[PDB]
């Protein structure tokens, strides 16, 4: 079993670093974020050294940080994709979950 790291993970793969708090995701499906890859859910940083570390902020495939992070119809529930949905028409949750310059993901 993977040992989730302490909350406060800082995602600085890009110019806009975001802190991920597993605590706010411990109730999520560890397989929904680290979906089953290579036959096993890669329980490692989303932008692993060759996973979502694409700084093109345009790769709309399964190998671009931005995409999986701002896209919704992704192989799995993405960051903003699970956010726009975890908000349930909640301008308050939509500004915190999907809010880019005024949410929790982009303090
Ligand atoms: C952090 C916990 C992660 C999140 C959030 C996501 N991933 Fe990944 N990821 C990887 C591959 C090879 C794919 C595609 C799998 C396939 O269909 O063969 C994906 C895909 C996504 C997507 C959607 C991509 C798309 O729609 O094109 C999202 C939104 C996504 N992942 C979120 C590989 C990896 C990986 C390799 C080591 C890791 C650690 C992660 N993904 C982590 C996350
Ligand atoms: C990409 C791997 C992720 C990052 C970076 C963040 N999330 Fe999420 N997230 C989810 C829920 C259910 C919540 C709480 C909703 C609520 O109670 O209002 C959150 C919250 C956050 C926050 C702020 C929360 C806080 O400050 O306490 C940040 C900064 C954040 N998330 C970043 C759910 C999901 C989810 C569903 C599977 C996914 C894939 C992600 N979050 C991904 C990321
Ligand atoms: C999405 C809501 C997630 C769930 C559910 C889980 N993890 Fe996660 N994890 C997520 C992100 C955004 C990142 C990287 C953020 C960054 O700062 O780059 C990670 C990272 C990890 C790591 C660190 C990478 C490493 O050193 O291997 C570990 C250790 C990890 N995640 C473990 C883990 C476990 C055990 C989970 C289930 C309890 C789990 N994560 C769920 C996003 C999400
Ligand atoms: C939290 C679920 C997010 C929301 C809502 C938005 N973005 Fe985001 N963005 C998120 C993460 C985890 C990251 C990477 C953190 C890091 O710095 O490593 C980003 C990054 C960006 C970037 C950086 C692009 C790059 O330099 O490669 C941009 C340009 C960006 N985000 C834009 C953006 C927009 C337009 C959004 C509103 C829909 C938005 N983000 C929301 C997480 C989240």
Curated annotation (Swiss-Prot):
Which annotated residues bind heme c 1?
22, 30, 33-34
Keywords, sorted A to Z: Electron transport, Heme, Iron, Metal-binding, Periplasm, Signal, Sulfate respiration, Transport
Where along this sequence does the record place binding of heme c 3? 25, 79, 82-83
Localized where?
Answer: Periplasm
Q: Which GO terms describe its cellular component?
A: periplasmic space
Top-level taxon: Bacteria
**Residues that coordinate or bind heme c 2:** 35, 46, 51-52
Example of a GO biological process term = anaerobic respiration
Provide the residue positions that the database annotates as binding heme c 4: 70, 100, 105-106
Please provide, alphabetically and separated by semicolons, the GO molecular function terms listed in this UniProt record: electron transfer activity; heme binding; metal ion binding
Q: Where is it chiefly localized?
A: periplasm
What post-translational modification does the entry describe?
Answer: Binds 4 heme c groups per subunit.
Q: What else is noted?
A: The second and fourth heme binding sites have unusual CXXXXCH motifs.
This chain's function reads: Participates in sulfate respiration coupled with phosphorylation by transferring electrons from the enzyme dehydrogenase to ferredoxin.
Entry protein name: Cytochrome c3
Provenance organism: Nitratidesulfovibrio vulgaris (strain DSM 19637 / Miyazaki F) (Desulfovibrio vulgaris)
Lineage, highest ranks first: Bacteria, Pseudomonadati, Thermodesulfobacteriota, Desulfovibrionia, Desulfovibrionales
């Amino acid at each position: 079993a993977p040992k989730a790291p302490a909350d406060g993970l800082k995602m600085d793969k890009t110019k806009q670093p975001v802190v991920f708090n597993h605590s706010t995701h411990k109730a999520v499906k560890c397989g929904d974020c680290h979906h089953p890859v290579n036959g096993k859910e890669d329980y490692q940083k989303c932008a692993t050294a060759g996973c979502h570390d694409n700084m093109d902020k345009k790769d709309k495939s399964a190998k671009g940080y931005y995409h999986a992070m701002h896209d919704k119809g992704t192989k799995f529930k993405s960051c903003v994709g699970c956010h726009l949905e975890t908000a349930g028409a909640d301008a308050a949750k939509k500004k915190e979950l999907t809010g880019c310059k005024g949410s929790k993901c982009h303090s």
